[PDB]
Symmetry: D2
Subunit: 216 residues, 4 copies
């Protein structure tokens, strides 16, 4: 019906075969790409660094340079989209996820399944040694009118000073075609910053986004 | 009643390019030589994609090792079991991720497989139903710790045009209890496999042969 | 002494594509205050049997300024210690393109020796059929795992005559003889937005590049 | 014009921008794939683990199950082939190389250029922590009559107990078309074992090879 004002997320799955589950609510601004979110565990203490859930934890808040993003258009007309993300880490770990949304006016309900495996017991994720996520640029292309393929190199800083790297690849599938003005402008880049304050069981997340085809 | 498997059943489901699919069926196998065969039928009408893309998605509990039980077999016997997480990244940009869960009762396996595929082009061999066969394949397995197997292979199909359709496969196995020392000593462990698939748009018959080895010579 | 940011450069670029040798030589200029470069190259061994677009971005980061001052490439030229470049590119159709760049400096002038080896480009692919029409505008990500190394990554795509893009994954390692300055090392990651243009025949090309480094667009 | 009995190698290039150069002589058996090689450094002590020159340091010794490999056939008629190898390591290092050959009867002369970068100072290569190369299966496909694409996951055991991994990819380009009996029989696998006895300045290398399409 309209652009998003609020949202809620049920995020669940497993890391190294041990189940996790978090729920919570959030808000954001569709005019500038800002979004905020609180999450609490429903199954006790998290076994892994909560930073590994960034960027898992809402592009319906992202505007484009000259109008609505395809994500925003898909929310307004109700046809929507599905997300499918893969992340391969330097130390052999793999993190795959799928996002499903439903829309109630200006409210979004997220159901995000997230499966992580192969994270070494002594690596930065399982030892809670991640400190921050690097600022990041995503490259988006449109191989057809109902598909976005997004790529970025994702890196955390760790307590040792070494970075922890992964190669991210995200596919968006739309039920209806994206508008002609979106498809004409390829590639579309998105710069993003994130912040996360976390405990063993709870986290508060913030994101800022800016889309651009050109910086000159 | 602990045993190696004689029969299995599968519920396999998920989506390809945002379109849901669901199949169910039953199979048998020989855990002395890695043979298995499976019949599946669709529960949501005709499949929108090449049934070959469900191989190798569609049971390593049938695989023996050269010196004795595989960790897959050992985890079935004692009932502690394992989970499977597979990622396949295709040459044309498509991605196929999946997650396998099992339950056991004696010599019978019940499989619940979730499979999500996206980014398969409209004119690619998956969506045009142009995959003709799966190449015979060698998997490499390593054990980074006593409860994890990392499996890698280069997965290729033949197509109608003669061009092969390629993907890079990575599979993680996560066990509830430690694998035995006789398993962990032999690294890398390689597995040579062959597959056959007869299919319509609603039904398929799958066969697989397997042979594990550390040394060809 | 003549320690300087670059005004001019020359390039000898050579190696092979699908086992057939090629060799080009030429001269160029640029503006190290805004990242602009222009380069003219001519073949010394006949017609190029591959799309000249496959030599982008092979065909000078000494022209790139950073937002707050010199880039490490500029600083390495200014003091003469310099750097080596090692680039790998893996293409969607299974082709492989690896290269190594060596430089010498005389004041504001750069001499480049670039070795470039391409293999596995299919006979009916867009490179060997001269079907590449342009290179997409592109954002590179740079990180510094130590004081003498830069690791760079980008997803590199061309438009083609068929209408569908030709993709590769690019990874570049820069190795510096002396440590990079602390102010450079503090600002990570450093992104670089770039545009390119290429006019070409089978034996000659005119290349243009525009660059803009940034840690933040907001 | 002959199958190989002996060979010599000049291997050179750099690791992390530092030049290296080795020369030496070897023998092998073209009827079973065995080859042995001894090399000496010409620029003093090597600054890296000599294990990182495996598998860099002669498929002209490899037979196929139905006769000559394409590598053997290319030597026997003199048309030959070029090799182009890329290896991407788990800690961010890259190793690329190019091999050229000339033939003098049953004697091969190899000129191999090897460039390695991004090997961290505390990684297994630069600390000399590699203990052995894992036994390995290569997969070979022929996308056309003059090209072979070789893939393998390459791992060393180390002194820490953790393996050191890379993803290896090799392209062979032939001057003449390979024979029909090769092109139809895809994929071709090759199982190999290696042994290395090394010092800072000298090494003895051994390799055993076996090509197969089916082990049932
Ligand atoms: Cl994304
Ligand atoms: Cl597997
Ligand atoms: Cl770069
Ligand atoms: Cl090889």
């Amino acid at each position: 019906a309209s652009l998003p004002a609020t949202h809620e997320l049920h995020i669940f799955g497993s890391f190294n075969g041990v189940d996790f589950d978090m729920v919570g609510r959030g808000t954001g601004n569709p005019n500038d790409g800002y979004e905020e979110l609180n999450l609490k565990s429903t199954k006790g203490a998290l076994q892994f660094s909560p930073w590994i859930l960034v960027p898992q934890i809402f592009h319906q808040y992202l505007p484009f340079p000259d109008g609505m993003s395809p994500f925003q258009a898909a929310m307004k007309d109700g046809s929507g989209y599905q997300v499918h993300r893969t992340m391969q880490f330097e130390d052999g770990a793999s993190l795959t996820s799928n996002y499903r949304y439903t829309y109630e006016g200006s409210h979004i309900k997220g159901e995000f399944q997230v499966i992580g495996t192969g994270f070494p017991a002594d690596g930065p994720v399982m030892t809670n040694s991640l400190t921050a996520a690097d600022w990041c640029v995503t490259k988006m292309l449109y191989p057809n009118d109902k598909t976005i393929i997004s790529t970025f190199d994702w890196t955390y800083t760790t307590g040792s000073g070494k970075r922890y790297q992964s190669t991210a690849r995200t596919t968006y599938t739309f039920a209806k075609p994206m508008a002609a003005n979106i498809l004409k402008n390829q590639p579309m880049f998105v710069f993003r910053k994130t912040e996360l304050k976390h405990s063993k069981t709870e986290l508060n997340f913030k994101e800022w986004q800016k889309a651009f085809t050109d910086v000159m």
